[PDB]
Symmetry: D2
Subunit: 398 residues, 4 copies
Amino acid sequence: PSLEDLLFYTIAEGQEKIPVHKFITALKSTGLRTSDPRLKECMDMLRLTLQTTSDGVMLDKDLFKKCVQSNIVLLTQAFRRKFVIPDFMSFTSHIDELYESAKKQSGGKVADKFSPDLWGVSVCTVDGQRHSTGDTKVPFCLQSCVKPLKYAIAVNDLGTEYVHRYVGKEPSLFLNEDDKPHNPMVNAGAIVVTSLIKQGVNNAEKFDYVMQFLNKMAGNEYVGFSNATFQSERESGDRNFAIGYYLKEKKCFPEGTDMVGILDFYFQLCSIEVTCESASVMAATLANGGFCPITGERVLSPEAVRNTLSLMHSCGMYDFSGQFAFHVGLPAKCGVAGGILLVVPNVMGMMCWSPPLDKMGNSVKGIHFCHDLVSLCNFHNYDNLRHFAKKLDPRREG
Amino acid sequence: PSLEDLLFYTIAEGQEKIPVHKFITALKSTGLRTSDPRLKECMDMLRLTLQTTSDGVMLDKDLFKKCVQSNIVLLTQAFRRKFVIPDFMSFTSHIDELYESAKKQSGGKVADKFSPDLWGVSVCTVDGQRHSTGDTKVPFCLQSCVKPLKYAIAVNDLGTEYVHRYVGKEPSLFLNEDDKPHNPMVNAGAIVVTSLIKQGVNNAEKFDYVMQFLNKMAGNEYVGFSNATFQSERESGDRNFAIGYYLKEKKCFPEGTDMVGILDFYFQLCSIEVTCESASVMAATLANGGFCPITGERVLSPEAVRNTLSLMHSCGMYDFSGQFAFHVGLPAKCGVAGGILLVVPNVMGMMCWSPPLDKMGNSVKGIHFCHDLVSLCNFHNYDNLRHFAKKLDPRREG
Amino acid sequence: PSLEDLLFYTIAEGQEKIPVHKFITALKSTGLRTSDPRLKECMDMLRLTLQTTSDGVMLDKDLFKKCVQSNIVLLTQAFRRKFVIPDFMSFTSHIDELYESAKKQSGGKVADKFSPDLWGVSVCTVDGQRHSTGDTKVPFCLQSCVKPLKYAIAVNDLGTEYVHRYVGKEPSLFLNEDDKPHNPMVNAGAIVVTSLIKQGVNNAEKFDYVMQFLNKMAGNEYVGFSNATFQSERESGDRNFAIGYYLKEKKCFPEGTDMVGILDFYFQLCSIEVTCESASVMAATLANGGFCPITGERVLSPEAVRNTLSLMHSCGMYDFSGQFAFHVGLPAKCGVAGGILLVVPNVMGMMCWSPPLDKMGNSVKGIHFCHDLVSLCNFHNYDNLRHFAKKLDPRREG
Amino acid sequence: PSLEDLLFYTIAEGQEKIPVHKFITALKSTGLRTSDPRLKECMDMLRLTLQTTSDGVMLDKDLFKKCVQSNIVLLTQAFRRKFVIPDFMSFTSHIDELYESAKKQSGGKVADKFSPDLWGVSVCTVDGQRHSTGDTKVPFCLQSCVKPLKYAIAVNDLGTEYVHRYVGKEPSLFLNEDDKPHNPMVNAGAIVVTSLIKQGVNNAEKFDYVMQFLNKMAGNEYVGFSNATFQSERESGDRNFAIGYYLKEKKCFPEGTDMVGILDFYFQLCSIEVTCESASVMAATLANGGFCPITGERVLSPEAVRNTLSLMHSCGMYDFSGQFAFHVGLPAKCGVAGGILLVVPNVMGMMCWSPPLDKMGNSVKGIHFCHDLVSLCNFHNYDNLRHFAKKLDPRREG
């Protein structure tokens, strides 16, 4: 018996007392962060114990048991290498290799304010393991990356049926044969989707509803808002105004939709800010069936998550979608600011961010990273989990 | 140390001798078939032991181990319930229920010859577990179902880069903007793919080679040829001759291709016969990373299997591909014979066969079953493996 | 010698005095109207002569010569049967038949205001000969019928080269590959054309200018404006706003176009009013090479008249344009109020008006008429003028 | 009276006799050729006189009446300037100038055998006036130019309603929405049209039925057949077999149609040979309401000649049809050998020939000519016959 104690002899080398930093280094290598919310109680009790004790703060069996008894379940999984990527220490070295090789990719043209030398990669696994390399804490806008997220919110609140009364499920002209936009990843679809979220309420409260929803998936990491970007998208969004009026003409919005107001809302949502780190948790929530991996909170119905990953796969890269789903085989969404919201189902989320776009408007370093990643690891949607050639499988040991 | 001995008392309740029927029963319930090629040695050693005496043979530790020792790796994996679906008996009960529901769907138009009340479904898991129900042993033609298999052969022999010099990878007019056919799931793509398989050799031996390949994928289960279908497809292949001549004009074939002969080959390949059972093993090879699960032989390269599963996802249902990959989320291919080649990556392959077709040319019961299957079990491409709502997961116990 | 005298005995059968009504009757029978502008001096001279006595006021050679000498060329051309249709009294009998056969056509749905039983036809030959039958003096709106006229204006003021930097000349999605609207008969094209008329000056004066121009083409017959139509067209021009924003994003307008203003103008232009009679003179000006046939003043350059007639042929019926150019072979534009602007080059212009439209939005009676017209008379663009089968040729005697 | 005598003093300057050569030069100047079939009798009687009076001829009134009394109608019309283009001698000056200006355009690629500096234009008016300059007696194949003619033949024998069951009449995909080819000027339409001409008979007599027909419209001038070309069009007619099988699939041909034998007929018709001269009469018959101008024989119904001219206008220049119909406005058809069958309705027919094609496959020198021609003369479809700015009008004198 004695769970908290089983752990205790695992981290102490058949010794009497664990040094506090040694437990912390043991914890940090599992990829978890000490700032992890599922660890607060443990980590508070740890700071308080350093506080009520002497300088050479060392934890005996009984004191270790006191701090860890509150989060022993997660702490046990973390230390028994039961997390989805057990040798997380090695995996992140490869993510570094992938980052550096993707960094030497110099091409591309920034949309038109940011520097073409920003290049950030954040990883968040379905179990909470974090890794980052490059400029991962800079705020940028989701832009078209918000489209999966707000479609998820719509489906989570209204169900696959209702949302898909107003938008289709097939890649793409503005409307398909049923006089609905083809799919919610294209602008015409996103605008109708935006017209479903929190109807009746006004755009100020709508925007807060989606803001708090994104906060839940980001594990309460940074979800911001660039009003500066908002002004530009609404001043030079002539293309979207075209879509808005056309949608209005073909009666695509729900009953009583203030079309010009839905467009302003829509311009706001494209202007929501994230960092690589915060958004990689958002991705990971989609990877994790709707449960935010660093909180354990259910944020999205599995219905909603499955749908969003589905359409991200078939419609998230626009015309490149067939090519991208062929070589990468991961659901992903792209953004003019240079972000790739990338989901490896059941394993992890990622955000890549390099502001230089390629000819198709996808961050060059992102796309190069995404290819490189699936080259290396058997994460392609149709790699075998048993016979995966010479690819490495992060999910296994030895 | 006693590998085969550990198994002995697992099957005999701390008793002296195991009746031979009890072991067989215990095997059949593991999902495996006594006729499994990977058990051939052991089943011969039992055919031998049943000769020394014509009375209910009881096997002691020494003589049991004498038969089981040649197949002990695979035999304990089954009895320790290590297979991809551990409780395989329960899982076939739901397959029966799913088969019965779809059987009540009497809609559909048979192409025009078969009988509209035939209906078989067959399962072959990645580990060789097999269940069938319905008319699983009647030969029917692959028709378009053959397109992923012969694509796979092409890429297996010539690789992604070469095969995709002649055909594209995105869903659909006959050519795309690069002057290649859109993808190998459509006739124009199928025809070009046919023209890559064993160039230089002639059409009689080409067809033998594909046939040897198709035998490998079915673990040497039933593959046949319906000449009657073959004459139909050539006598009425007016659209196909058009596609061929157009392909000839736009120089889509490789150097020195006899297009009018390539069409015959193509009509041959569509006329290949399978049954549910044999085809379910084929699908299962694509389920299993390219290893035929009932023989263990590597039949198709991971590269070839991945690509084939990719293009089935995006192009295997044609227009219905978005609709279908949204709700069902499994790579499939249909054929006018009534066949749905179904693949559940990493779990199993299937063939569904009911000749009544809907207005899209897909098996009515086949489609209904596919939908029920993902309704019931978390096999959808983008279900979570951890949070999957009230869906059942056959990969787990209890 | 003695022209005015030569005419004199032509009207008096070897007699001394001509009863003034008898000249009037002989005038009206050549087709001209006593209100004809080219006859105003003579009619002033006759009002004076009818002022000196109140008793039939017969005219001798001296007083007749005193009235008609100011308009003797036109008058002898009428009485010496030099006009484009000489036996014009006959020709209007057939226009009455055509009017009647077509009044029996009951189909159609009025767009949504008017009454479905209004039906007028107006003819004005290139020589000023006038005929009407039915409700030819009710004001209605041109709607899209205005699109040839304002295209004619643009080309007249800017020439073909300039106008066709901004719009194309082929039938049809909004833009062509040159990112110009397809042709100025489609709404996207009309809007671009609208933005070229009198750039710089504001929308109140731009409207005046087009109005002055429309006056020149109707020979100062009725042109009005329906603010009722105007507010409706702008309240519900959602599709036109969609088009306006799209054209703005694709940079289709000239530099410095207030696009939401150009739409307003456009709605104004569509709300302009004509009667059958006034619009038939407008048609007749395009019929007569750019000279208003009832005033003789050059309104439009031969360049502009040619381009307009050309684009009405190919683009004026939208979808019906091939069917119509095949069977009817007369350049025409249609309007949702029920207007068919008809042009028989070198012979006459015409207006038909019945508010009931068919499914393609063309006046039912209008279209039946146009087909009937070309059944009867060799006006089809590719009828022969020498061997026209059994068709009637109004251009000839006997 | 005596029309012959009135003609007689018109050539003789109030003098006793007419030198036979003076009458001949006066006749040739009107544009007629002495070989004109309508002049056969006159010219026979004339040659017989030179034999009967081997002096200096010189015909007195009685003798001139004896030669001309048989063709007096045509002969006076020629000499009283009654022909459609009365000052024909000056008109040919312009054709020569137009020819020389078009001769300096050396651009273009000959399709692939002929020489790039071959350039002939040949005119035949509706009245029989001839003029040619350059290589007008070299044989070349109609190629696509036969399409208007064989369409005309179809509608001659079977009428508008019937032919257009099987083919549409709107410009361009291989079929349209009605599953008929779009119009008889594209291959898809021409191949169906071919399958309507003289059904039931076999290809050997069908080709003589069409050949005797072309001979009539060419006034029995050269109509030949290149069996040389005919091999080329069938060896490399892959696209045509594409179209053929597709049309067979969609049952576009009439009941009991040998599609492979229609394709063979079709290749023959494309290989028929003409010269500029012989084909210029062919065009002219279309300009003349179906009457071959140099014979007076009615070769085609007016219904048929209308239809053909209509579709030449809208579909005869393929994608260039709208541009061409805008700037040139004449019905014309182009051919890969370098021919432009060109009709100026009611005025003349004409054939142009330069083998260098432009990017669109149209005789570079022909197209330049066609533009130069309508620049010069008010022959554009929507030119005014009364107000035509700086253009010349050959239909007038002075």
